């Protein structure tokens, strides 16, 4: 029923509909669009930053010293051209809790993995380079589902030994 809808720059409007049966999908963020009674679908994707609290319990580095490392990461859905095809075909309309939970578990695994990759002396002295390597290893996979990594680091480190 609703016709000629527009969305602000914070959210991306996604529409898809076959005018003559051919696949015509339009994804526009903060722009203009029109949709008739049943020509396409009117949905929006919230491109706001999702908060991350990665907290790994009883995780060990190369030398094996057990640590309970808590992290913080900045994640947001990207605005590229071909990657937003994947973003639109991928997730919505699952709600924000679903984004945050999925990204939380996957970055939890990735963070524990890279934490095991380097030693505790490195996470002690040079952990800015640790975050730089976290970017280098997490961009290839976290970007597959259209989620960007604006920033990454670890919140606090606690040890029982």
């Amino acid at each position: 029923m609703g016709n000629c809808h527009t969305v602000g720059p914070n959210e991306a409007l996604v529409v898809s509909g076959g005018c003559c049966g051919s696949d015509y999908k339009q994804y526009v963020f903060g722009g203009w669009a029109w949709a008739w009674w049943c020509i396409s679908d009117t949905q929006r994707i919230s491109l706001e930053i999702m908060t991350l609290q990665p907290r790994c319990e009883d995780v060990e580095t190369a030398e094996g010293v057990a640590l309970t490392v808590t992290g913080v990461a900045q994640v947001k859905i990207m605005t590229e051209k071909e990657l937003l095809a994947v973003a639109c075909e991928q997730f919505l309309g699952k709600n924000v809790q679903d984004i945050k939970n999925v990204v939380l578990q996957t970055l939890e695994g990735h963070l524990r993995s890279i934490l095991g990759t380097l030693t505790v002396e490195q996470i002690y002295q040079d952990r800015d380079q640790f975050a730089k390597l976290v970017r280098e290893v997490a961009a290839p996979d976290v970007g597959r589902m259209g989620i960007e990594i604006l920033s990454f680091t670890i919140k606090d480190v606690y040890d029982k030994v």
């Binding site: 010293v65 578990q105 695994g109 524990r112």
Partner: protein, 154 residues
Amino acid sequence: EKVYTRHGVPISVTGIAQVKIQGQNKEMLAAACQMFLGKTEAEIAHIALETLEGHQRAIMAHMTVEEIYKDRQKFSEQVFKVASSDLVNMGISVVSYTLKDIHDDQDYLHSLGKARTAQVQKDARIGEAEAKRDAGIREAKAKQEKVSAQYLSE
């Protein structure tokens, strides 16, 4: 839970996977529609969960624990390759697979961790010994001078 490695040591291993139906591929989607119509999300998740658990628990005996926590990238890549092949055969493509947590109820890894803790505690004690000797030497010497001067005055 309680899965043996290639040494046979049992370790509790948790994994997390992100699986999606690649509708871009016409052939794969057509194959998937032949059985996934009429199935709820819970059952769809559960069946692939058991399949991926089978693949992970089978590959458990390929790579040892020493390999899994140290060399995790090659492990994850091989797991993804094999699971993705056998699941695209079924019709689901795994977006990304990861290992959540590794737990040992046999105290196998705790000693390996404690070794380095001892190796650093020896340094912690050596520093204290340095500081104590350096403080005591000159404290005693200054004590000596003040007493000598006090008796000279007496």
